[PDB]
Design a protein around this ligand. Structure first.
Ligand SMILES: *[C@@H]1O[C@H](CO)[C@@H](O)[C@H](O)[C@H]1NC(C)=O
Ligand SMILES: [Ca+2]
Lengths: 122, 238, 137
């Protein structure tokens, strides 16, 4: 399955962004789609995930309440609505499937197309 | 698995393919009809939810692991001292909703006993559906390969892994490379034959690249984890 | 831990070895009473931790049977699994054994055993709780 993330940009504290992850491949491989983030010099962090039928959503504690994840299965697209952003949300955001994010070598790089840069500064 | 060969049916009957929403994510080892040993870095949130996991046993190819042919996982238990940043104590247990039926293709591997007295470079085997080359895709077929234990003193040398190998870790492979576990083999078995018994001595944990020189595979030290494993099984049974 | 104390947990708790496997749960998570039976070496020598002797010792074959073997396997977490058990001669130069008290009553399996310097059967128990470790020749 091929994932292209987009929607990143620069905002100030309090702003909002809506990220998109468009998937190309067998729908069976999209049963669980997730968003991760990585700021420079820091460990990668889980952000959110959603089941294909949308009946289960997951959120990291640090983003719970502010972010909302959704799907549109006829577009095969996952979206992450991020509201009330702070500077500590600044990172490159990545979408991935479990077969991608569970890594024997965690320091192996993720594909560029999976990511989109989000910067929060005033 | 890099540098191995495809397995025959019944060659590694404890090996399971662990799927998230019917997609292979991690390997595992059968130890009882209902308990599977895998890696904690396979089941970090949100993959701590047993609802997502199914186990496929006695099947060699991914194309034959259909919806409904696998065993639903009922419980997922990570080691309480697992540290995601270092992968220290990288072991987890899955309990199946329904017990497996053992036969020629599905059998358990033995948990190691205290006092195995393994050789410093004991001959071992790894197996899994991991990539057969660095950055490759999941293998459709189960592969397996011979690796040797590498003494932790050597693995912790400056030119290898430089003091990253803890007592909850063991190293195996070849400092020259060429043969190694790889992406998709996480959680799978590292086994050895002694006294005509196959013993589970490691679970695939981490490494730097695949099959590169002086970057061998690192495995959870199952012998160290046996007390914890027995405690979870005992607490479940009653 | 100091003075040969045993770690209950990874939270710093230390307990005197005389209370390890003594039949009373002293550790916060009961760790002192739920790992009292083990199988030693590639030949599966049954061993029990003696609170009397503060160490592991093999089990005499005197009066042992499959019902006791099943109790040992259940204490280890193997539930209703049982594979094989037989008396074997001791190979570790051991003068110290755990011997069965046939009139012990309804206590933990490891508390039905008492320390002894000799086995009358001259054999110790070898025990396997599950058939494992076999593959294609
Ligand atoms: C065996 O158990 C009974 C009942 O607890 C006790 O009276 C007896 O002294 C015990 N024998 C030994 C040798 O410990
Ligand atoms: Ca006690």
């Amino acid at each position: 399955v091929q994932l292209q993330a987009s929607g990143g940009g620069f905002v100030q504290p309090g702003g909002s962004l809506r990220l998109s992850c468009a998937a190309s491949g067998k729908v069976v491989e999209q049963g669980l789609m997730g968003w991760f983030r990585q700021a420079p010099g820091k460990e990668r962090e889980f952000v959110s995930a959603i089941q294909y039928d949308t009946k289960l959503e997951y959120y990291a504690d640090s983003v719970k309440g502010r972010f909302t994840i959704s799907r549109d299965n006829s577009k095969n697209t996952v979206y992450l609505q991020m509201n009330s952003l702070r500077a500590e949300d600044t990172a490159t955001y990545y979408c991935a499937t479990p077969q991608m994010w569970v890594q024997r070598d965690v320091q192996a790089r993720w594909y560029w197309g999976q990511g989109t840069q989000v910067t929060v500064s005033s | 698995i890099v540098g191995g060969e495809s397995a025959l049916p019944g060659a590694w009957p404890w090996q399971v393919s662990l799927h998230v929403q019917n997609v292979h994510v991690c390997g595992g080892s059968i130890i009882t009809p209902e308990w599977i040993v895998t890696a904690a870095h396979c089941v970090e949130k949100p993959l701590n939810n047993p609802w997502h996991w199914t186990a496929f046993a006695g099947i060699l190819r991914q194309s034959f692991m259909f919806y409904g042919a696998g065993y639903q996982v009922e419980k997922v238990i990570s080691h309480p001292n697992y540290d995601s940043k270092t992968k220290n104590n990288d072991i987890a247990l899955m309990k199946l909703q329904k017990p497996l039926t053992f036969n020629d293709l599905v059998k358990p591997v033995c948990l190691p006993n205290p006092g195995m007295m393994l050789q410093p470079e004991q001959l071992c085997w790894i197996s899994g559906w991991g990539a057969t080359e660095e950055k490759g895709k999941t293998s459709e077929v189960l592969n397996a390969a011979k690796v040797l234990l590498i003494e932790t003193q050597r693995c912790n040398s400056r030119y290898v892994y430089d003091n990253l190998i803890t007592p909850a870790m063991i190293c195996a492979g070849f400092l020259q490379g060429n043969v190694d576990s790889c992406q998709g083999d996480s959680g799978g078995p590292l086994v050895t034959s002694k006294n005509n018994i196959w013993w589970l001595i490691g679970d695939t944990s981490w490494g730097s690249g695949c099959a590169k020189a002086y970057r061998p595979g690192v495995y959870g030290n199952v012998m160290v984890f046996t007390d914890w494993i027995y405690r979870q099984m005992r607490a479940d049974g009653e | 831990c100091s003075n040969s104390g045993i770690e209950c947990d990874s939270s710093g708790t230390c307990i005197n070895p005389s209370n390890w496997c003594d039949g009373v749960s002293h550790c916060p998570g009961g760790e002192d009473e739920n790992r009292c039976v083990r199988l030693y070496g590639p030949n599966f020598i049954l061993q029990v931790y003696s609170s009397q002797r503060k160490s592991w010792h093999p089990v005499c074959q005197d009066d042992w049977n499959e019902n006791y073997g099943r109790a040992a396997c259940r204490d280890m977490g193997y539930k209703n699994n049982f594979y094989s058990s037989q008396g074997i001669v001791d190979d570790s130069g051991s003068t110290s054994f755990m011997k069965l008290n046939t009139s012990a009553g309804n206590v933990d399996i490891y508390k039905k055993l008492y320390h002894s310097d000799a086995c009358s059967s001259k054999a110790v128990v070898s025990l396997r709780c599950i058939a494992c470790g076999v593959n294609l020749n």
